[PDB]
Enzyme design. Structure first.
Site, PDB file in Angstrom:
ATOM      1  N   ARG A 177       0.847  -1.197   0.000  1.00 60.96           N
ATOM      2  CA  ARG A 177       0.000   0.000   0.000  1.00 60.96           C
ATOM      3  C   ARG A 177       0.874   1.234   0.000  1.00 60.96           C
ATOM      4  O   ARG A 177       0.865   2.063   0.926  1.00 60.96           O
ATOM      5  CB  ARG A 177      -1.018  -0.053   1.132  1.00 60.96           C
ATOM      6  CG  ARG A 177      -2.014  -1.204   1.102  1.00 60.96           C
ATOM      7  CD  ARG A 177      -2.947  -1.093   2.313  1.00 60.96           C
ATOM      8  NE  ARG A 177      -2.174  -1.295   3.572  1.00 60.96           N
ATOM      9  CZ  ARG A 177      -1.630  -2.437   3.960  1.00 60.96           C
ATOM     10  NH1 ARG A 177      -1.853  -3.569   3.286  1.00 60.96           N
ATOM     11  NH2 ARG A 177      -0.695  -2.481   4.942  1.00 60.96           N
ATOM     12  N   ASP A 242       2.265  -8.429   6.806  1.00 58.02           N
ATOM     13  CA  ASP A 242       1.191  -7.764   6.102  1.00 58.02           C
ATOM     14  C   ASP A 242      -0.023  -8.509   5.724  1.00 58.02           C
ATOM     15  O   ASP A 242      -0.583  -8.070   4.607  1.00 58.02           O
ATOM     16  CB  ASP A 242       1.736  -6.662   5.196  1.00 58.02           C
ATOM     17  CG  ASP A 242       0.754  -5.545   4.950  1.00 58.02           C
ATOM     18  OD1 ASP A 242       0.384  -4.888   5.935  1.00 58.02           O
ATOM     19  OD2 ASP A 242       0.265  -5.332   3.799  1.00 58.02           O
ATOM     20  N   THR A 243      -0.253  -9.753   5.985  1.00 58.91           N
ATOM     21  CA  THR A 243      -1.435 -10.467   5.485  1.00 58.91           C
ATOM     22  C   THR A 243      -2.519 -10.711   6.508  1.00 58.91           C
ATOM     23  O   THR A 243      -3.683 -10.357   6.308  1.00 58.91           O
ATOM     24  CB  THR A 243      -1.035 -11.725   4.650  1.00 58.91           C
ATOM     25  OG1 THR A 243      -0.094 -12.451   5.515  1.00 58.91           O
ATOM     26  CG2 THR A 243      -0.259 -11.380   3.341  1.00 58.91           C
ATOM     27  N   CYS A 348      -0.758 -20.333  -1.738  1.00 62.57           N
ATOM     28  CA  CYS A 348      -0.147 -19.798  -0.555  1.00 62.57           C
ATOM     29  C   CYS A 348       0.350 -20.973   0.346  1.00 62.57           C
ATOM     30  O   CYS A 348      -0.457 -21.767   0.872  1.00 62.57           O
ATOM     31  CB  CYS A 348      -1.127 -19.138   0.462  1.00 62.57           C
ATOM     32  SG  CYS A 348      -0.248 -17.930   1.459  1.00 62.57           S
ATOM     33  N   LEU A 349       1.616 -20.832   0.641  1.00 61.36           N
ATOM     34  CA  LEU A 349       2.250 -21.847   1.518  1.00 61.36           C
ATOM     35  C   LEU A 349       1.826 -21.584   2.968  1.00 61.36           C
ATOM     36  O   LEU A 349       1.714 -22.524   3.749  1.00 61.36           O
ATOM     37  CB  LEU A 349       3.759 -21.801   1.245  1.00 61.36           C
ATOM     38  CG  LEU A 349       4.303 -22.669   0.119  1.00 61.36           C
ATOM     39  CD1 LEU A 349       5.777 -22.380  -0.158  1.00 61.36           C
ATOM     40  CD2 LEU A 349       4.178 -24.138   0.525  1.00 61.36           C
ATOM     41  N   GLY A 350       1.611 -20.322   3.258  1.00 59.31           N
ATOM     42  CA  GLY A 350       1.276 -19.831   4.577  1.00 59.31           C
ATOM     43  C   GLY A 350      -0.180 -19.907   4.958  1.00 59.31           C
ATOM     44  O   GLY A 350      -0.541 -19.449   6.056  1.00 59.31           O
TER      45      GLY A 350
END
Ligand code: HEM
Ligand SMILES: CCCCCC[C@@](O)(Cn1ccnc1)c1ccc(Cl)cc1Cl
Length: 405
Positions: A177, A242-243, A348-350
């Protein structure tokens, strides 16, 4: 500030969407994006903002594009081009088969087995943070929980000092952002200046942290290089910082406004997992893209080599063709269709970590603070970008309605 229309773009496909500052941002970020799925909007449009780029607006197209790495390359995944150009994170800026090796390693670090190991700490930190807030009858959810919660867990995993948070978080926020205060590459550099010394250090004297495991890992029978580790670690950092942070705020903003949804979870806890998926669909928040590797005709539109195309992961689940009454939150939907965590080889691995963090937050928050709302006269501001966010989330509650555990 629109860019001149390239010769190959039919003017009937023009729709000037600014992914960084969409028009009805006031209404909410997901709502602002959903304008793209109105009847007046073609499935695939060209925007003249942010230098000019395609945007696929339907789940069918997004998924197809995501599957098709041959034509849609991850080499330049972010808009504007200079951002996608400057980014060289691994495995994200790679296409299969090369991606696969790096992925395999990152998986060692964030995967299922790690989450399982970290579970008690996640639970521990959540409970602690909530209990600490409970008696106050008011926080800033964004600064008070949404940030510390996921961040401290990451810091622990990565074996980095909590003291670095504020600085790292800033750099990360600049990437997804952008503020106008730096430049993507400048941001990237500052992050790398941070990382370099640490990596060197963990090559020499390895630990058990994530950074050590990446720095000393194997890729295609040989050892990862210092540059490659730097590049993987950079991604892990943005993901950690950030997620989950932004997701929790959207979710919490919704729960704060919907007593009935809260109650539902309190009485029928077996629904939490299901509700987690539903919230991931409704409050989806990532938008990145791909670069055309060659001239290619996709769903009757001519794409030219080097054209960038935004394939908003956010949009799939908000698509009416995918989910009936998209903007409505229903924990009992027969099928929750989303691509919140991506699609294709770059899944996404996370995700497992993210899910664990969400479910823990819901269960634990509702246990202790079943009844809360947004602070009177607080105006919630959403922010758009590669990852969308909530500016601040003033909550209030009556301590007398809370429960200590
Ligand atoms: C709600 C939380 C999250 C969301 C919605 C999310 C979303 C996504 C998306 C959409 C992608 C694919 C991007 C593309 O195809 O260009 C991605 C990839 C990735 N995410 Fe996340 N993510 C989240 C949390 C995390 C966390 C906590 C981590 C770990 C630190 C993480 C690590 C990764 C990695 C390593 C990849 C790259 C996979 C590859 O390229 O093979 N993510 N994520
Ligand atoms: C100029 C881009 C700014 C940095 C992107 C952040 C993130 O890498 C991290 N992340 C996100 C999810 N997991 C890690 C991401 C976000 C969205 C998408 Cl689509 C892909 C990626 Cl790699």
């Amino acid at each position: 500030n629109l860019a001149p229309l390239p010769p190959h773009v039919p003017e009937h496909l023009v729709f000037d969407f600014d992914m960084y500052n969409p028009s009805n941002l006031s209404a909410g970020v997901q709502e602002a994006w959903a304008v793209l799925q109105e009847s007046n909007v073609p499935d695939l449009v060209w925007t003249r903002c942010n230098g000019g780029h395609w945007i696929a607006t339907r789940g069918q197209l997004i998924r197809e594009a995501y599957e098709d790495y041959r034509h849609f390359s991850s080499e330049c995944p972010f808009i504007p081009r200079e951002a996608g150009e400057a980014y060289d994170f691994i495995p994200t800026s790679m296409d299969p088969p090369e991606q696969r090796q790096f992925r395999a390693l990152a998986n060692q670090v964030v995967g299922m087995p790690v989450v399982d190991k970290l579970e008690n700490r996640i639970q521990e930190l959540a409970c602690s943070l909530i209990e600490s807030l409970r008696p106050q009858g008011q926080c800033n959810f964004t600064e008070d929980y949404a940030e510390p919660f996921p961040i401290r867990i990451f810091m622990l995993l990565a074996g980095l000092p909590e003291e670095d948070i504020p600085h790292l978080k800033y750099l990360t926020d600049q990437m997804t952002r952008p503020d106008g205060s730096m430049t993507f590459a400048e941001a990237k550099e500052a992050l790398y200046d941070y990382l370099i010394p640490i990596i060197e250090q963990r090559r020499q004297k390895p630990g058990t942290d994530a950074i050590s495991i990446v720095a000393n890992g194997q890729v295609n029978g040989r050892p990862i290089t210092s540059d490659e580790a730097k590049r993987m670690c950079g991604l892990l950092l943005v993901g950690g910082l950030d997620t989950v942070v932004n997701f929790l705020s959207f979710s919490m903003e919704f729960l704060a406004k919907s007593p009935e949804h809260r109650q539902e979870l309190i009485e029928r806890p077996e629904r939490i997992p299901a509700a987690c998926e539903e919230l991931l669909r409704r409050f989806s928040l990532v938008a990145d893209g791909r670069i055309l590797t060659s001239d290619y005709e996709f769903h009757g539109v001519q794409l030219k080599k080097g054209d960038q195309i935004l394939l908003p992961q956010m949009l799939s689940g908000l698509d009416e063709r995918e989910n009936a009454c998209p903007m409505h939150v229903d924990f009992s939907r027969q099928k929750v269709s989303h691509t919140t965590f991506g699609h294709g080889s770059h899944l996404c691995l996370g995700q497992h970590l993210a899910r664990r963090e969400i479910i823990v937050t819901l269960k634990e928050w509702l246990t202790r603070i079943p009844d809360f709302s947004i602070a009177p006269g607080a105006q919630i501001q959403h922010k758009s970008g590669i990852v969308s966010g909530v500016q601040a989330l003033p909550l209030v509650w009556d301590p007398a309605t809370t429960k200590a555990v």
